[PDB]
From Swiss-Prot:
Active site: Y171 (for methyltransferase activity), H283 (for methyltransferase activity), E309 (for methyltransferase activity)
Complete-protein stretch covered: 1785 to 2163 of 2593
Methyltransferase (CMeT) domain: region residues: 176-350
Organism: Monascus purpureus (Red mold)
Function: Non-reducing polyketide synthase; part of the gene cluster that mediates the biosynthesis of the mycotoxin citrinin, a hepato-nephrotoxic compound to humans due to inhibition of respiration complex III. The pathway begins with the synthesis of a keto-aldehyde intermediate by the citrinin PKS (pksCT) from successive condensations of 4 malonyl-CoA units, presumably with a simple acetyl-CoA starter unit. Release of the keto-aldehyde intermediate is consistent with the presence of the C-terminal reductive release domain.
Protein name: Citrinin polyketide synthase
Length: 379
């Protein structure tokens, strides 16, 4: 299996070009008001949903006087870490003061706008970011039921077609994700222009491909570039793969396979791939050292990992995904699944990657997610 030549300069020069355009991708992709104008509104909607759930669970937070002691709401033990984050959000919104175990009400009034009016206005005002706001209310309106076990967050999202459509749109269409996928397209296109042509394929493996939020852009891109390629789309979920096998049959350069990031690679995967793509999946594993070491062993020596990772917490993301067991699997010293790029570099370097870089910019959104590239060998 002779694969393409992949000079280090092609990677580093393409990444530098993409990196310097980060703020351009944020503006073009309609994310340039997200941190300062959209996120306070989605955070407000989360908080309102929380207040409603608390009232439903017997906490009179809406009517409580200043300094009133509030009892903790009921919830399943598995939600302890999440609910500490939830109470944190209420404190950041200045509705409560926390003092260790003691929760007390502030003088700040709860908003009088309903969550229905909040959503309606946000959907009308910010239609490009609709998907995550709809998802926020899908679980948010059932928040008391979820944290007590009467409903399950994973079932709510994926058990209905409406939820499945929203979450696909979140991963593919919402600027908060599409910006950096589009930037990865630019990186890869500039990369391929710098490759020798030997007739041999570029071998690309996507981990955690899930709903195909990245995949749906990569395949037309590789189709249009027309250089030999084998694209292996993988995920832990066999249903998501089976669906993708149908959806993406159009493309003849495709392989589809169930692959667990946490598993040691079978011999057939060892040193096989030029590029591993991984969008917001590696953080969901138990141990980042183990996962990134596994990924390293699947890379050819001339290859690299391209992470697309959320590097800063966003309240609506925690509010929704924090309901899911998959958000709390870390057991490697992290206190949250998501980590800043500096931590990712620490892990990546410690398991043998030779060069780590990431996107940055002056816009605040450039800190929310990053492309993080990690070369298997040191240049
Ligand atoms: N151990 C593991 N190995 C592989 N994929 C995993 C995994 N743990 C979680 N995942 C997958 O990682 C994805 C995280 S969702 C992030 C969005 C995703 N790339 C998309 O476009 O849909 C999900 O598809 C989930 O099934």
């Amino acid at each position: 299996l002779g694969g393409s030549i992949l000079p280090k300069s092609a990677i580093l020069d393409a990444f530098r070009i993409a990196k310097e355009a980060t703020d351009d991708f944020i503006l073009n992709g309609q994310l340039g008001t997200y941190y300062n104008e959209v996120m306070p509104r989605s955070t407000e909607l989360c908080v309102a949903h929380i207040v409603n759930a608390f009232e439903q669970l017997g906490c009179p937070i809406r009517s409580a006087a200043a300094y009133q002691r509030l009892e903790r709401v009921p919830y399943l033990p598995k939600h302890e870490r999440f609910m500490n984050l939830i109470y944190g959000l209420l404190e950041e919104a200045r509705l409560i003061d926390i003092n260790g175990s003691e929760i007390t009400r502030t003088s700040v009034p709860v908003s009088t706008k309903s969550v229905e009016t909040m959503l309606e206005e946000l959907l009308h005002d910010e239609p490009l970011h609709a998907a995550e706001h709809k998802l926020t209310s899908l679980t948010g309106s059932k928040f008391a039921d979820c944290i007590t076990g009467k409903e399950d967050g994973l079932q709510l999202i994926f058990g209905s077609p409406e939820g499945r459509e929203i979450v696909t749109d979140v991963y593919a269409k919402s600027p908060i994700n599409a910006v950096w996928i589009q930037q990865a397209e630019f990186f890869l296109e500039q990369l391929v222009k710098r490759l020798p042509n030997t007739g041999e394929p570029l071998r690309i493996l996507e981990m955690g491909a899930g709903t195909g939020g990245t995949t749906v852009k990569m395949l037309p891109l590789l189709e249009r570039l027309g250089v030999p390629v084998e694209y292996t789309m993988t995920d832990l979920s066999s249903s998501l793969i089976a669906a993708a096998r149908k959806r993406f049959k159009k493309y003849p350069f495709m392989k589809f396979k169930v692959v667990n990031i946490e598993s040691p690679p079978d011999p057939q995967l060892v040193h096989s791939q030029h590029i591993i793509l991984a969008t917001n999946c590696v953080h969901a594993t138990r141990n980042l050292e183990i996962s990134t070491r596994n990924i390293h062993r699947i890379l050819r020596p001339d290859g690299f990992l391209l992470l697309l990772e959320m590097t800063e917490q966003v309240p609506w993301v925690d509010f929704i995904f924090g309901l899911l067991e998959g958000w709390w699997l870390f057991e490697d010293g992290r206190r949250h699944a998501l980590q800043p790029a500096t931590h990712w570099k620490k892990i990546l370097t410690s398991v043998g990657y030779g060069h780590v870089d990431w996107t940055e910019g002056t816009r605040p959104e450039a800190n929310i997610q990053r492309l993080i590239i990690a070369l298997a060998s040191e240049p």
